[PDB]
Amino acid sequence: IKTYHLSNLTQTELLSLKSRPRIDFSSVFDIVNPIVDDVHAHGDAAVKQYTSKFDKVDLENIVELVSDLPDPVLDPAIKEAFDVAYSNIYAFHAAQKSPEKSVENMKGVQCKRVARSINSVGLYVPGGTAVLPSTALMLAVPAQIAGCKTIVLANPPTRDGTTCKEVLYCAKKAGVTHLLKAGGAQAISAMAWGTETCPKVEKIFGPGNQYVTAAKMILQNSEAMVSIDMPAGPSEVLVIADKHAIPSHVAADLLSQAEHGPDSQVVLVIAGDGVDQNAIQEEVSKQCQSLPRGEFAAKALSHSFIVHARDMLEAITFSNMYAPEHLIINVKDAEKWESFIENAGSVFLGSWTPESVGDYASGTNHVLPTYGYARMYSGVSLDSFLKYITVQSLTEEGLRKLGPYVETMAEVEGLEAHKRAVTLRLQDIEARQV
Amino acid sequence: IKTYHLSNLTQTELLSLKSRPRIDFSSVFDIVNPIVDDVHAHGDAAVKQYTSKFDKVDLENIVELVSDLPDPVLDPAIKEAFDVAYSNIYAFHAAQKSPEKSVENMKGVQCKRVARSINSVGLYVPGGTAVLPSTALMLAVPAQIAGCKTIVLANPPTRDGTTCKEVLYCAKKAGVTHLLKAGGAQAISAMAWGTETCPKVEKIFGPGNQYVTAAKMILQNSEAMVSIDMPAGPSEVLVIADKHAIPSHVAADLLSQAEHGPDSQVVLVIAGDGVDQNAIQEEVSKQCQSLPRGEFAAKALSHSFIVHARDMLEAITFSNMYAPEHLIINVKDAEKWESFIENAGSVFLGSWTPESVGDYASGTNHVLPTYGYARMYSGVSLDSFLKYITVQSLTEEGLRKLGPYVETMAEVEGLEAHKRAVTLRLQDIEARQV
Ligand SMILES: [Zn+2]
Ligand SMILES: [Zn+2]
């Protein structure tokens, strides 16, 4: 409910706004380490125990090959909607391919950067009661485009043990190879180390909850030889609204984020004068009462806050400091403010572009950096699933011309074998002129 | 000396060749962790103390604004060599800028991905017994191209408290804003947390020794809010050689990697037949005893190994498994095999392209993934210094076309607030034209 005016604040007060409520992950590591170690040591049996324990389901086989599962049949309207998403997500991400053009800054010194897919990747889509086929498209489409050979999707089952069929449809469309019917730390460990039946993966994506996230943090510093997309905290939106924003559409934007759960973070920034803060707030109350996830949204909004900025430059400056997962800019001429944005996972410009268009189908990626990590991490993209290999090839003339400079730098550095690798080659070359 | 043949080996045995020796991080962690904490709590005073103990230097001004440092004067061959290097590294990295073309897969649905620099960055360049201006260019040039506002270059001082003069030259050329005259874990903490005079940075780059590396690793899972380039181990080279390779050149390539240190890892893969392995081992021995760092190279070569492959495909396949920091391909028609390489930091094709060319001046980046982390990490590049923000903007028509698909997918996921944010908007649009 809290309201702040940027003119009222000291440098110390600013800073407490920039930082999210502390999550002590050390605490969460203590809970997660035994689970990670158990799966590491005892494999599928251990995974089955934790799945029985936490998801209250007992599994025969925790992994299946997706190409052996039947094509599920969906309501045609539902199917077409996910085909549209797929199509837009596919096109946005395919357009991120780098051309691989060679640089020749001196004659005969040809260098280039080429993309190779990460061979094996693991994707975490939360499950049980959550039905998250959208996240499945977000992780698997760019994997598919990148060409990854093994694609493990981890998706904890419903209370009976049934795979969410929309997720499965999405997984089949994006070439997921393996479906791992587990969640939690236990699923992260199984992909990081591999098991009797779950392939070992080289990189793991999707933030899951704070327990998934902790295991990812832990396993990236372990011997498992696994990298992750990014660390994480709760989901967030920051909305900037000016007097041209419709109060009820602003309210709906706040609740759209709030309904993700009690820990979602909402920030309303009011840029300029003439905005009816009251109407927005009342409109939030009215809309919240009919939401089936209204209890979640209300718990979330109990630690939301409002910020008054006297102008749009101040609003954006505050948003840059904050570094929001999602940024909504509902102000006149929103597009013009783009070159002022420095830190945000994803940006929604104007009045017709709610967060859920990006959550589902605009084509951008919704697995975005939270907690302030947009300061140095990007949302998942095609490049998240590639390594770039640098290549250089010299001709004789190139080495003739570049070698001496190399000789010089190696001497300066005290590295004489580095020098001789070149000199010995130059001797051979000069020896073959008569 | 030690040799293997790919035909003679079991699965069990290949997998042993793939994996590097384990490093005891536990002992390193015991050293590093209280250093980090101490710098976090006590700032520059804590840093001064550690510099005094390990580097044996007592210095009051540990952070220097590079602007008001006088240009060093170095001999002119040396200036000219680093200038060529600067030029090739610049050109190579500048060619990596993405176009930011908008995607419009459905009329009025406009999406894009824009580059924004990481606002502050830290660059680690080893000192004391090392002199590493090449690394200064490798880290600093793409930061400068990326437009990072604060660039902190950590480099421990020489015994009199001065900065290594070649390193300072490269920092001024590449636009480093601050110089932190400290090394080791204490340097890393100072950049990760900020001190009284050292700016806090968002990302830290550069291998260092195992103390630096452990500090980077701890700090990436800490509350400091800092990412890292990549984890790391000892540097490595894998050289693929066929019968057309000149044995002495092959030997000088191995020594070039080996002279880095006793842990530097070296692998020779002999592909096909007609290769004088003896001439190569003889040549390694003559060359090794005529080197200043010959004792370092010999210790490294004691844990080197050879692999015989019946053909080049099998050689490449083995190399793809091993996933070397550096790969040299000295075979016939080396360029043609490019498409078969899946895992390698940087590649050197043909007879005239030694590792040291890439270490110094080809333009590629020498800060590369070791220990098999080439399976999922790239070398440092322009992208390492950027976040890519995704942007979407819808017209009214765009939302009229895409919104209904989104309402449905929101229904499926049980996320009514996500649906309503679209519906209120579609209602407003409908109200207006009637
Ligand atoms: Zn959402
Ligand atoms: Zn080197």
Residue numbers in the entry:
A (entry chain B), B (entry chain A): 43 to 476
Please give the exact wording used by the authors of the publication that reports this structure:
HDH (EC 1.1.1.23) is a bifunctional enzyme that oxidises L-histidinol (HOL) via L-histidinaldehyde (HAL) into His in two sequential reactions, each coupled with a reduction of one nicotinamide adenine dinucleotide (NAD+) molecule to NADH. We show three crystal structures of Zn2+-bound MtHDH complexed with: (i) imidazole (IMD); (ii) HOL; and (iii) His with NAD+. The three structures reported herein are isomorphous, with three dimers (AB, CD, and EF) forming the asymmetric unit. The MtHDH monomer is composed of four domains.
In the MtHDH complex, IMD creates two polar interactions, one with Zn2+ and one with Glu455*, which bind indirectly to domain II and directly to domain IV*. IMD faces domain I but does not interact with it. It is possible that, for stability of the dimer, there must be a link between Zn2+ and Glu455*, as we failed to obtain a structure without IMD (or an IMD-derivative) added to the crystallisation solution. In the MtHDH/IMD complex, Gln299 Nε interacted with the carboxylic O of Glu397, whereas the Oε was H-bonded to the Oγ of Ser277 and the Oγ of Ser306.
